[PDB]
């Protein structure tokens, strides 16, 4: 399943995920491709952060659905 | 062509209403706000002036 | 009706989805979404993110969505408890408008208030009397409460 990550520069990161993944692994996903540290990713989907411990399927992530990517800066 | 108000389609054979700025929408949509009010939903040109 | 106008506006949202917002049902109740808005750029509110609840009326479009923050926010618009007082959720409201509209104009409101019509006195005296006063605060509190 492919989602689509939006960052604040517009640039929209394609990933290739499943229902049951994690929001880590999708962050996980995110380091691997753009670089970023988990712990500086926000996730937004729906007006919703994006828990670590919940899943791609319990927020209704679904196929070309977009997430959001904002980035903490800690 | 797609009504403002309900984003759906206007299509050949519904009942439209073209406002006298040059708005279409569906008439049963745009009745519902010009019961309201006496603007258009698009430009907010007054339908009486 | 409402429900339908929802879902195109949902569908579209999909889409095509803006950056700097996001939005969406909190459940499977349509009527009731949540949005975040990204602090608007050139603004004290950037790198936050801000949390909205969406209320859509029975009779929307032709009734405005109750759009609230629930991030707090310094903003002469905005009190806590997160009411707006931005003309197009009340007397400029028209059914042509659609929640990303608003959700821009909410942004709009956050880059360019209006201290002139303010919903939080205290915060208007200061945005034009001081504004590196409110800007500093309006920093200050994104970072402690959008970030
Ligand atoms: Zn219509
Ligand atoms: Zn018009």
Redesign the pocket.
């Given at each position: 399943m492919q989602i689509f990550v939006k960052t604040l520069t517009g640039k929209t990161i394609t990933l290739e995920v499943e229902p049951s993944d994690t929001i880590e692994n999708v962050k996980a996903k995110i380091q691997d491709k753009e670089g970023i540290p988990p712990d500086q990713q926000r996730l937004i989907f729906a007006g919703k952060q994006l828990e670590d411990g919940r899943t791609l399927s319990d927020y209704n992530i679904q196929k070309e659905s977009t997430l959001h990517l904002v980035l903490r800066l800690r | 062509e797609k009504?403002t108000?309900?984003?759906?389609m206007?299509e050949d054979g519904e009942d439209v209403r073209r406002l006298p700025c040059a708005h279409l929408?569906?008439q049963?949509?745009?009745d519902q706000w010009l019961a309201m009010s006496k603007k258009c939903p698009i430009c907010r040109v007054d339908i009486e002036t | 009706m409402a429900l339908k106008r929802i879902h195109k506006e949902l569908n579209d949202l999909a889409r095509d989805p803006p950056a700097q917002s996001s939005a969406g049902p909190v459940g499977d109740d349509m009527f009731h979404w949540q949005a975040t808005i990204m602090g608007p750029n050139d603004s004290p509110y950037q790198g936050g993110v801000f949390f909205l609840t969406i209320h859509f009326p029975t009779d929307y479009p032709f009734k405005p969505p109750k759009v609230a923050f629930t991030t707090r926010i310094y903003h002469p618009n905005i009190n806590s408890n997160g009411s707006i007082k931005l003309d197009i959720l009340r007397s400029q409201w028209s059914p042509a408008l659609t929640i990303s509209k608003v959700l821009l104009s909410i942004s709009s409101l956050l880059s360019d208030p209006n201290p002139d019509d303010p919903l939080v006195p205290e915060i208007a005296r200061i945005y034009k009397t001081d504004r590196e006063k409110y800007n500093r605060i309006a920093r200050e509190w994104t970072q402690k409460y959008a970030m």
């Open positions: - | 009504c108000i309900c984003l759906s206007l929408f569906h049963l949509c745009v | -």
